[PDB]
């Protein structure tokens, strides 16, 4: 069959944002169908995102992120049948990030560090905070104080935000486990 886009994908989006795509399939008889969105720089190097099954109508609504590259190819794949890709030119974000801590309104402490020293500083800070959390609370203290330390790093110019989600993933599974352990036999 053929696949089409019911919504125009926004060209030139911000660096690390996301956008919705409205992709609808053709000769889908009545059943949900698989799809995958390979997004990446250059058609050869694609990173897969957005698994899921489209609705019985044949239209699926998906979320696509934007990489930190000048040219990004986004390829909707039916997983077996026809596929299609389109190119997007997201705004590039500079490697060095400058952070301004505002104190007493007008005065602002502005500073920017090279990415390597910022990464190592954030890593050592995460070590210290996770060790303190382990000493204080325990194995759950590891996760709690990791979240706290990564928050305090995000407040400064340090480790990026998405690292949080990693921890936020790992907690979730653990939570599920305990809930299950309190439900069945």
């Amino acid at each position: 069959g053929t696949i089409s886009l019911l919504s125009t994908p926004p060209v030139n989006p911000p660096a690390y944002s996301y956008f919705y795509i409205e992709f609808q399939f053709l000769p889908t008889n009545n059943t949900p169908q698989p799809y995958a969105i390979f997004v990446g720089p250059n058609p050869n190097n694609l990173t897969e995102v957005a698994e899921g099954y489209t609705l019985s109508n044949g239209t699926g609504y998906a979320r696509v992120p934007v990489i930190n590259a000048q040219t990004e190819y986004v390829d909707i794949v039916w997983v077996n049948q026809n596929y299609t890709m389109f190119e997007i030119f997201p705004q590039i974000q500079n490697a060095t990030t400058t952070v301004t801590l505002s104190a007493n309104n007008n005065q602002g402490f502005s500073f920017s560090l090279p990415t390597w020293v910022s990464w190592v500083i954030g890593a050592v800070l995460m070590l210290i905070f996770m060790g303190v959390g382990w000493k204080f609370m325990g194995p759950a203290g590891l996760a709690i104080f990791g979240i706290f330390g990564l928050f305090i790093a995000m407040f400064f110019g340090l480790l990026p935000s998405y690292l949080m989600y990693v921890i936020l993933f790992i907690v979730a599974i653990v939570g599920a486990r305990i809930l299950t352990k309190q439900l069945g036999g």
């Binding site: 104190a103 007493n104 005065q107 402490f109």
Partner: protein, 69 residues
């Protein structure tokens, strides 16, 4: 101990009472047309009042944490 709590209470009250004079002095040094301190230094002075508040809120904390043991 009761004595430690009383001392911490009076210390916190003293900190609250003479916070405004410290803030006014910092503003006199930094705020205004006269640049007594350069940008980085001026931002540092604007940070000092909060560092002072942090000291007022951490000193009883470490005191209790070490005392209870």
């Amino acid at each position: 101990n009761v004595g430690l709590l009383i001392g911490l209470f009076i210390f916190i009250l003293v900190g609250i009472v003479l916070l405004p004079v410290i803030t006014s002095e910092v503003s006199s040094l930094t705020s205004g047309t006269s640049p007594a301190v350069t940008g980085t230094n001026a931002t540092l002075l604007n940070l000092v009042p909060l560092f002072y508040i942090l000291i007022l809120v951490i000193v009883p904390a470490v005191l209790a944490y070490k005392m209870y043991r």
